[PDB]
């Protein structure tokens, strides 16, 4: 049998704010490669034939970004199916969608946008198709978490998952979220419907690439009240003798597997990328086939691209990348950051946990801790950068203007915090 | 147990024969001659190959099997000289054909002598000069005259009444041709997924699916089947599957016009591959 | 001496053989020179005489009261006991090795060490011998809660339903000094069980843990298990 | 066995020619898995069996059970279709949406004891409409069933002030309930001169696994019939039909037209197809396009029915305070029906159509519900809707559609 | 055609993604296999523009994974064979054959090429001997096999700590009967005072006579050096890469530093940079001997060998 697969290219939650009203979450480039391609190559290397690519919000330039891609050309194994409409708006309305329409056959993957991963899951569909033909399609969800530790940086606190499962036939029986909540509340028919044993799991980073059956799309057909995967794992615990259907789980050691939603997300999931833990997903070894992203992996995680030019005094210690045409100045201290291509840098700069993007231009005297930088954007001399800052599509700060903790500056007027010009003072 | 392929006791001058290599020497290579009762013969290492040779070692891999031209042959002197060096790969890959079919034919006239219990060499020698050097010499093709012969006589037996052995050897190597070389069976299944949402659906399924019926050749029926509600199987269970996955395809192409002529579509879930 | 040995008599002899002899014989086996045992006086105050009838080394038998639990049966012997606790019942017979639960009462150097053998429900870390935590709706209004702290230092906890109380403790000192210190509590087994796993959630702290045996199994006050002690002691006793 | 025929010009609902389905006889009680039971107990246990398939909506959809009530080799005269939905939430919203739907309520009383199932039932039967009460507790002690026979009668005493005056209190009770109910229940008036619509509820596939090429059986429908009367051979219209979303916008829905080649019951039925009863059609149909539950809502019209398929229906929104009925020993503001949210799912049941729709915009008097699928029952028919509250689907308003967004492909 | 470049381009995400296939030897087969298809599937009037084609695939396919040689040096191998034939013909037409049964020479050079060593094998093993390698490799544990045939010695195969495939040689060797030990990987100066040779493999040899192997070898070879006992270096000739050592810095091949500090760590591994280099750099003065399937050389004649197999104007690709 085939391999079809669910791409949810938009996550419709007010989120990345007011980033998203640019250019899209799965656009955003985590080292110089939009995360729709981290997600086509891990479905690539997963084994998927044909993938369903499903787009509602800037769909246009989704759809003119990855078709100059490499898993649109002829020559790709994996087939995508573009398929974009502007009434769905929710995860559900695209399974409905995929059930109105009768894509998939059996066993098909189900994932966003916007996760990261190399998980090789066929273990994972060799267990979910033998439950499937011995309980005779009665499991239907294979969801796969990794095992973390909760005090990790990547797990933040807004996605934090608790579930309570067995640990001998891998079946799901309780799913919740730390949304606010000091003490968890667990229910009981768990323990009297199994007496032969049961365990609770704090341990589990969720990866969304929940592996499904087409009774997903059948469930989310019945139930409209369905909007998303959490709402569905709820209203599928809580009944139980009606619309049986028990969720099974696949836990991963020594592969990776994660997703973004905020800033935390996307630093902590950015600093893994350059750190090599998404290996064989690396930025120097060009798995989007383009000129303008190959890199040179050098000592303490130090990619260099083509025409550099670093200038006297600039020292490189850890996790840096630097992109196509990024000229950089004299003294500067660059560390755990990545920096797009075709960028200017001042003189006497820091920059640490940073995320340059394409464009931009730093003058000299800046000190820039912990922040974004998207595209185009500038920045004059004697100014400092606190943590958390957001710089989003050519904002220019002025001289003498120190910016807070709290700080998110755009185009928007009331979507971000303050709108700047060539002088910070409105 | 044991005989020669042939009726002759030694290759003749540039025939090209199938040899496993024993042993390694300074002179060259000892082989033995699978073709002709195993007699001792020598690749010699000038004729090894084309580029310079530092070792014999280096391409001569003992325990396997290879084609090699014969340069000198010396029936007094029992000197058989092998090249490597002269066969083409078209060559090498005829040599392998000729002795796979020759091969086969031992095989068979050996599970009919085994088969008719003739313990003796001379007995056995007897049957194949019956059986096989006897139409090896009338078509004047040794292995494939013979191999042609016995594929004729897995169809048509008239060719092993000629053959005057017995009248329970002739049986016994009609029934040991019949089980070896007459194996005439393959499965060319397909997958085909024919609908139409119109008016009448089901009419123009049900008539697509009578003329993909209607289009089945003589000895090999295009059965269709319900694998799916949008999805048809379409198995053809005959023999020739080069012919018939040319049939299935012609059926497919038959099916989808007459899906396309009633306004329905008419998509390939599998190509005629062999089950 | 590191240990003392305590019986505990609530409602009793009533099998194939005395149900005082097999608790007291384990404890002879393995050491325990000396054994103080708590007669009953609820059902009849008359079994002292009964415990005093074996032909063991030494026996330390006390008069009690009628109305009283484990926790004052505790609370009663205080100014005579000098070292840790190691608690017992009569109706317990046992074919697990004794030296597990006070081999995870040295190593780890912990305040309460018990055991197990397959209503109340346990979460035990995944080491296995570390326990978290164990409820009953007998006491129960909500369902079931589990505290954050212990989800965060502790991320995966194997809960157990099955599991029984064979009564074999392992109290220290400062244990006996709190249950003494506080008298609100009448039966120990469900006043140093829980308020100790409620403690433990604090570093330095405490360490509580238990031992799952799955070689045999307890017996209970009621008739239920009445009919097994025969089957028990007929296969199990003859190695001993 | 029957003697029906393709001959009629102008049929009765109470005729004996037919013998397939006469008249509906709904049921909403206590029973928590005990109304099925009773049904199988009047009519038959493995009587209706037809074409199974995978339970996709089991507390969606309405199962009818047909009885044919005999009188005195005995003789048939009218059958009753026990319609037995789990959930009595769904069955209220089926009926409170139009007219001629659950014409005779049966109340499935406990001789057990006066809870508050019993009193949500004789809302939801208060808020439908004919009552049947029945006491279904049987085998007790005389004594006390006659003191639960007085407590069910006080409380039926405050059911008099609505509908409360029938009298019941094991096969002989179910024959002389039969009896009472074919004494009592007098024959609706059903309307045959209309157009047939046949809405269709539970949709299966006729055609096995590896059948035969010719030997195919595509889009064995089943539903129930609103109103008029189904032949065989007649061109059904799908009016739903095929929704497709392919031209990257606003989903076109093109109806798709189909012969009716036969009208299969529960037995075997004739050409001539009567409402009131859960009629199976077999039509021209692909499998592909009549899959299992696949072509559920779909109103299967004859001549071409007027109603468009709506994409959005601006509706007066009325929603009731609390819930009727439901009321706790707790009560901790559970039964409070909240307003009317913005990107609220709601579950709209106009006449047997139960559609999702989110509340895209309200102000005060009318909610625009955008539908998930496309509905088409009429431009001012009264709309139910419902809610969740607790793991079931329960009803939370009424109202009368203002204003729809039509939309009819070819 | 176009299915000649369906078989490219799996190739190349083949080698992009993982180890397929897993040894070398079926790697080697399919390069020359993949090359032979390549020269069979176009049309050319000059050797020069099979040349060009040639090193622009060439450059593609180690553009694909920099860290493995063995495609490039095949591709190399290739353009040398190409370039003997063109100046042997120049001093027209049946080259094409003339490069196809090269490259079937060239298989069978290769598929013979571990049980040659094995059959040299007999000229380094004596009684009662205890012999140290490294990692997991099927020419070493082959020579070992049946080098106990008619010896009876001792094995310590040392684990590596990225990925301990030392376990799977210790249970194929133990199984073959050669009494053999299993350790870690930092005992190896703690039990170098009872090693008397050094018999392990490697990945690529380089122009110099310098080698990368299995991480942590170079510690072995200087706990050797320290010890003077010799080094046996079982490696067949086509991982043997004219590749300078300090070049571009792309030697080590990094992965994924789950395997050395797990995921499960905790907050600490913020702050904290993981490194697991999967190869190491041996110089060639820390190595005694080579063994190939044409016998044994020195480190000081693996420019002979490189000047036979390679040419000059082809190190670039």
């Avoid at chain 1, 940073?354 to 954007?377: E, F, K, P």
């Avoid at chain 3, 209004?141 to 392992?170: M, N, W």
């Avoid at chain 4, 039932?121 to 279904?136: G, T, V």
Wanted: proline share 4%; hydrophobic share 40%; glycine share 6%.
């Amino acid at each position: 049998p085939p391999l079809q697969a669910v791409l949810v290219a938009d996550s419709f939650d007010r989120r990345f704010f007011p980033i998203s009203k640019d250019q899209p979450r799965v656009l955003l480039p985590l080292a110089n490669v939009a995360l729709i391609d981290y997600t086509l190559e891990f479905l690539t290397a997963t084994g998927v034939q044909e993938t369903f690519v499903f787009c509602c919000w800037k769909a246009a330039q989704i759809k003119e970004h990855l078709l100059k891609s490499k898993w649109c050309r002829p020559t790709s194994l994996n087939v995508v199916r573009i398929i974009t409409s502007e009434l769905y708006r929710s995860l559900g309305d695209v399974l409905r969608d995929v059930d109105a329409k009768a894509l998939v056959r059996s066993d098909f993957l189900l994932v966003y946008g916007d996760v990261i991963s190399n998980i090789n899951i066929t273990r994972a569909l060799e267990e979910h198709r033998l439950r499937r033909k011995l309980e005779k399609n009665v499991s239907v969800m294979t969801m796969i978490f990794k095992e973390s530790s909760p005090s990790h940086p990547t797990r933040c606190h807004e996605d934090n998952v608790v579930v309570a499962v067995d640990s001998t036939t891998n079946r799901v029986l309780h799913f919740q979220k730390t949304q606010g909540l000091r003490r968890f509340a667990f229910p009981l028919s768990l323990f009297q419907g199994s007496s032969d044993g049961v365990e609770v799991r704090y341990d589990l980073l969720d990866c969304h690439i929940s592996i499904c059956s087409p009774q997903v799309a059948q469930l989310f057909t019945d139930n409209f009240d369905y909007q998303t995967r959490d709402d569905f794992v709820r209203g599928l615990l809580v009944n139980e003798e009606i619309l049986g259907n028990q969720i099974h789980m696949h836990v991963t050691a020594k592969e990776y597997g994660a997703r973004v939603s905020n800033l935390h997300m996307y630093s902590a999931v950015c600093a893994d990328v350059i750190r090599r833990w998404v290996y064989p997903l690396t930025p120097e070894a060009n798995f989007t086939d383009s000129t303008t992203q190959s890199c040179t992996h050098s000592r303490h995680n130090i990619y260099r691209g083509p025409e550099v030019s670093l200038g006297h005094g600039s020292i490189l210690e850890e996790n840096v990348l630097l992109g196509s045409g990024t000229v950089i100045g004299s003294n500067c201290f660059i560390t755990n950051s990545v920096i797009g291509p075709g960028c200017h840098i001042g003189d006497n700069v820091v920059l640490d946990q940073t995320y340059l993007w394409q464009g931009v231009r730093v003058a000299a005297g800046a000190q820039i801790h912990q922040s974004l930088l998207c595209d185009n954007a500038e920045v004059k001399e004697r100014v400092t950068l606190k943590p958390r800052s957001v710089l989003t599509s050519q904002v220019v700060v002025g001289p003498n203007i120190t910016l807070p903790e709290g700080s998110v500056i755009s185009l928007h007027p009331p979507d971000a915090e303050e709108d700047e010009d060539d002088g910070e003072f409105s | 147990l044991s005989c020669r392929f042939y009726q002759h006791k030694f290759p003749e001058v540039e025939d090209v024969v199938m040899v496993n290599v024993r042993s390694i020497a300074e002179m060259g290579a000892y082989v033995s001659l699978l073709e002709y009762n195993n007699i001792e013969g020598m690749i010699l290492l000038s004729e090894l190959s084309r580029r310079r040779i530092r070792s014999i070692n280096k391409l001569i891999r003992i325990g396997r099997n290879e084609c090699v031209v014969v340069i000198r042959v010396d029936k007094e002197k029992g000197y058989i000289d092998l090249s490597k060096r002269r066969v083409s790969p078209e060559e090498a890959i005829k040599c392998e054909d000729k002795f796979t079919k020759s091969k086969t034919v031992y095989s068979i006239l050996r599970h009919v002598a085994e088969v008719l219990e003739y313990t003796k060499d001379e007995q056995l020698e007897s049957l194949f000069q019956r059986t096989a050097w006897v139409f090896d010499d009338k078509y004047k093709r040794p292995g494939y005259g013979a191999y042609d012969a016995f594929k004729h006589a897995v169809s048509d037996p008239s060719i092993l009444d000629s053959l005057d052995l017995n009248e329970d050897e002739r049986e016994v190597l009609i029934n040991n041709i019949n089980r070896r070389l007459t194996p005439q069976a393959v499965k060319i299944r397909a997958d085909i997924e024919v609908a139409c949402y119109g008016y009448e659906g089901i009419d123009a399924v049900k008539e697509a699916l009578r003329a993909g019926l209607n289009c089945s050749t003589e000895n090999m029926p295009i059965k269709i089947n319900l694998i799916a509600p949008p999805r048809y199987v379409m198995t053809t269970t005959t023999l020739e599957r080069t012919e018939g996955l040319s049939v299935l395809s012609q059926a497919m192409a038959v099916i989808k016009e007459k899906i396309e002529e009633k306004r329905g579509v008419f998509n390939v879930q599998m190509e005629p591959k062999v089950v | 001496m590191e240990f003392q040995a305590v019986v505990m008599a609530v409602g009793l002899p009533v099998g194939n053989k005395p149900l005082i002899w097999y608790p007291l014989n384990l404890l002879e086996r393995v050491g325990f020179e000396e054994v103080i045992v708590v007669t009953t006086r609820d059902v009849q105050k008359a079994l002292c005489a009964e415990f005093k009838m074996k032909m063991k080394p030494d026996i330390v038998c006390i008069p009690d009261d009628a109305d009283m639990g484990t926790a004052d049966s505790l609370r009663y012997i205080y100014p005579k006991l000098k070292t840790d606790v190691l608690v017992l019942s009569c109706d317990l017979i046992t074919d697990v090795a004794l030296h597990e639960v006070v081999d995870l009462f040295r190593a780890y150097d912990a305040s309460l060490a018990m055991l197990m053998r397959k209503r109340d429900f346990i979460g035990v870390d995944s080491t296995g011998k570390r326990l978290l935590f164990m409820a009953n709706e007998a006491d129960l209004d909500e369902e079931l809660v589990i505290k954050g702290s212990i989800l965060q230092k502790h991320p995966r906890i194997r809960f157990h339903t099955g599991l029984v109380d064979a009564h074999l403790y392992c109290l220290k000192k400062y244990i006996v000094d709190f249950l003494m210190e506080n008298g609100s509590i009448t039966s120990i087994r469900s006043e140093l069980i829980p308020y100790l796993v409620r403690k433990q959630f604090s570093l330095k702290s405490l360490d509580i843990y238990s031992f799952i045996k799955e070689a045999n199994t307890l017996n209970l006050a009621p008739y239920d298990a009445c009919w097994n002690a025969c089957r028990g002691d007929r296969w199990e006793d003859l190695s001993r | 066995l029957t003697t029906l025929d393709v001959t009629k010009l102008t049929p009765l609902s109470h005729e004996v020619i037919s013998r397939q389905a006469t008249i509906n006889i709904g049921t909403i009680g206590h029973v928590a898995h005990g109304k099925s039971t009773v049904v199988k107990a009047i009519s038959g246990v493995h009587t209706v069996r037809f074409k199974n398939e995978l339970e996709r909506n089991i507390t969606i959809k309405l199962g009818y059970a047909n009885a044919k009530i005999y009188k005195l080799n005995f003789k048939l005269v009218r059958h009753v279709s026990f319609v037995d939905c789990p959930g009595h939430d769904i069955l209220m919203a089926t009926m409170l949406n139009g007219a001629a739907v659950m014409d005779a309520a049966l109340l499935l009383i406990a001789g057990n004891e006066s809870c508050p199932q019993p009193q949500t039932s004789e809302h939801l039967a208060a808020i439908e409409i004919h009552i049947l009460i029945l006491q279904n507790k049987i085998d007790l002690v005389k004594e006390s069933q006659a003191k639960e026979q007085y407590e069910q009668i006080l409380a039926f005493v405050q059911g008099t002030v609505a509908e409360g005056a029938p009298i019941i209190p094991l096969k002989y009770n179910i024959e002389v309930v039969c009896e009472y109910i074919v004494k009592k229940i007098p024959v609706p008036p059903r309307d045959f001169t209309s157009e047939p619509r046949l809405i269709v509820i539970r949709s299966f596939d006729v055609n096995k696994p590896g059948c035969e090429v010719d030997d195919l059986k595509g889009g064995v429908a089943g539903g129930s019939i609103l109103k008029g009367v189904l032949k065989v051979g007649q061109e059904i219209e799908v009016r739903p039909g095929i929704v497709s979303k392919d031209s990257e916008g606003k989903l076109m829905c093109k109806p798709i037209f189909s012969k009716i080649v036969s009208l299969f019951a529960e037995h075997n039925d004739l050409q001539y197809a009567a409402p009131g009863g859960l009629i199976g059609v077999g039509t021209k149909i692909d499998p592909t396009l009549c899959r299992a539950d696949r072509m559920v809502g779909q109103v299967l019209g004859a001549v071409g029915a007027l109603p468009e398929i709506f994409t959005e229906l601006e509706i007066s929104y009325f929603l009731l305070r609390r819930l009727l009925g439901v009321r706790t020993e707790g009560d901790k503001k559970a039964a409070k029906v909240q307003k009317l949210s913005k990107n609220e799912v709601l579950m709209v049941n106009i006449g047997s159509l139960s559609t999702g729709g989110r509340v895209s915009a309200v102000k005060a008097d009318l909610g625009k519900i955008v539908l998930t699928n496309p509905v088409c029952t009429e431009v001012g028919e009264k709309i139910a809707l419902s809610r969740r509250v607790e793991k079931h689907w329960r009803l939370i308003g009424w109202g009368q559609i203002r204003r729809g967004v039509t939309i009819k492909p070819t | 055609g176009s299915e000649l470049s369906e078989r490219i381009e799996s190739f190349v995400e083949t080698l992009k993604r993982g180890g397929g296939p897993r040894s070398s030897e079926e790697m080697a087969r399919e390069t020359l296999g993949l090359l032979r298809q390549i020269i069979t599937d176009h049309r050319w009037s000059n050797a020069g523009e099979l040349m060009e084609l040639i090193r622009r695939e060439g450059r593609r396919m180690t553009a694909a994974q920099p860290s493995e040689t063995t495609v490039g040096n095949m591709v190399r191998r290739v353009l040398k064979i190409i370039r003997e034939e063109y100046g042997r013909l120049h001093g027209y037409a049946q080259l094409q054959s003339n490069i196809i049964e090269a490259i079937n020479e060239l298989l069978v050079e290769l598929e013979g090429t571990m049980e040659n060593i094995a059959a040299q094998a007999l000229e380094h093993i004596h009684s009662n001997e205890v012999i140290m390698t490294i990692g997991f490799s099927r020419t070493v544990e082959a020579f070992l096999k049946e080098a106990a045939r008619k010896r009876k010695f001792h094995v310590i195969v040392a684990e590596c700590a990225p990925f301990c495939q030392g376990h799977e040689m210790a249970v194929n060797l133990s199984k073959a009967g050669i009494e053999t030990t299993v350790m870690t990987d930092a005992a190896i100066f703690a039990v170098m005072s009872r090693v008397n040779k050094v018999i392990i493999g490697t990945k690529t040899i380089l122009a110099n006579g310098a080698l990368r192997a299995v991480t942590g070898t170079h510690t072995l070879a200087l706990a050797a050096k320290h010890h003077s006992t010799p080094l046996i270096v079982c490696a067949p000739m086509f991982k043997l890469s004219p590749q300078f050592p300090n070049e571009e810095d792309s030697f080590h091949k990094f992965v994924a530093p789950e395997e050395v500090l797990p995921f499960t760590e905790g907050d600490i591994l913020e702050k904290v940079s993981v490194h697991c280099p999967v190869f190491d750099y041996v110089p060639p003065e820390l190595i005694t001997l080579f063994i190939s399937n044409i016998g044994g050389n020195a480190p000081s004649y693996i420019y002979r060998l490189m000047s036979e197999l390679y040419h000059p104007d082809d190190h670039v690709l």
